[model samples]
Target: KLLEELRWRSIQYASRGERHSAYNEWKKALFKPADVILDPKTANPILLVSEDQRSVQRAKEPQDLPDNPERFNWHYCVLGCESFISGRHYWEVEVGDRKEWHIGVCSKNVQRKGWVKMTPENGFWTMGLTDGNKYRTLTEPRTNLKLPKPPKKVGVFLDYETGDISFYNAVDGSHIHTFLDVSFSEALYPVFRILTLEPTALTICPA
Candidate 1:
């Protein structure tokens, strides 16, 4: 009720354009740009990690990838090679054209088998796109985001010490959502999930 009411108030009074300006001006000063790469060892067989390791996409069919202990057997998910345990980090993901996707951070110790329930309590903090138009935070209670349109480029900001993880529209720097007071015990890795069978790649871009 509290979060719902606060979100309503923010939407009613705060201009998104103003928030965009503020985010752009202050982001560089507060966050360090992270070079994220897809970790092939953790990728599901249904996903293809680019040679450069900066992008991942779903293939027409499953590839013969090794069933490593770290690989996601069922979920079409992958982790970034880089992991962080402290400080503030930021990265941009270019989600062009094709619809559904999940992007955020998960603990290095996240589950690799079975259907994963992505939530803060499950050591996964993420936001996803569905129905080609809706974006929502994958929290325990699951809150749908109210956006004019889907952002082509999404920016992820993580603050380990502050216990915060936030997302933004990378193009305009408009705020999307934030998960506060997220408890972290292990190193954190950038996580990506491509639910669309369409031809689209989720590429990691520079800040």
Candidate 2:
């Protein structure tokens, strides 16, 4: 199983059924770096975005923000200002000592209200950490991930054309997981969510 192999080491994932090896250089050169900034209009009131919009963290009290259509009313989540429809994009987030956080991409039109599960069927393709140490993919049925080394900074690689999204440990360049063959129709936005009430912010690293 290719998915099983991808968890331990970096490998070039083939969309056309071919085996290809991926070194660090190959991975770095394959995707264009994305300048991801948090979209204030799409942020939940409980999430506070930085002035430059490059970081976000949970607020103790809900902010007095407008109840806009794009805003996430219930979830403590935010979307990146930039949108992508066709191309490969890569970005990294500094999770640092944050115990619980989610990093990935979601469709522009994904539902943001009520008790909605953040799954591929719900237009969200994400990997998250919860209860401090447990890591898993936020897909339907959810996949529990066992990593060789935990990542403090996580890299997200999105191939919009190929419908592939891969997560990597930016600290050591180890492959984490990939959601392949996703059917992305609407424009996709980099999605972020910090679950713990801690003051740690999820900072977007400079591309």
Candidate 3:
């Protein structure tokens, strides 16, 4: 709302040509989603999704929720509704104080009924942070990363056309890690999971 008011006010003071030029430049630089919400139907029963479906966190106690085939039974996780077949996109998540969580994308047909490994070879391309302030890439033979500090917010950038998925620290915009030469046969969806109890949240930030 503030941005809308500012846009109109600024346009009124600017020349017509300047307005069109500024609009084009703004669109060209905007790669991140202005709004992206999580999907509750695919969320685990142990997790709670916000009403707006933009955030998720651990539940305080056992929840007697519906058990669907697509809902995670043993993992605290959820998949975002935005799907990517090809192109470049970016988004960020506010992890806050959460030290252990999963964030990345998986294939459209990833197994949802069993205890499957969240590895790239199995269609998962995620990276996570552990309690010791170490980062781990969920690829085959998981590798750990050394960073200056734990990320308060994480950024995910995907170049589907170039087969690159990169993660960055939103705090300082430093490179965390990336998966390259990834082969995808189906559409990909953003996925997130946490290993903490109540009060821990993972919020999708708006551009």
lDDT of each: 0.83, 0.83, 0.75
**Which of the predicted structures, 1 or 3, would earn the higher TM-score when compared with the native?**
1
Worst 10-residue lDDT window for candidate 1 reads: 1-10
| Over 4 Å off, model 3 | 1-34
Tell how far residue 172 is off in model 2, in angstroms.
0.6
- TM-scores for all predictions: 0.89, 0.88, 0.82
Model 1 residue 181 lDDT score: 73
Q: After TM-score superposition, what is the CA distance of residue 6 in candidate 1 from its true location, in Å?
A: 16
Q: Candidate 2 residues 39-134, lDDT tens each?
A: 999999998889999999888889898898999998889999898998888898998888899989999889887668899998999997988789
Q: Candidate 3 has what TM-score?
A: 0.82
Model 3: worst 10 consecutive residues (lDDT sum): 1-10
On the 0 to 100 scale, the lDDT of residue 202 in model 1 is 89
Report the poorest 10 consecutive residues by lDDT, candidate 2: 12-21
Backbone clashes in model 3, listed as residue pairs:
38-53
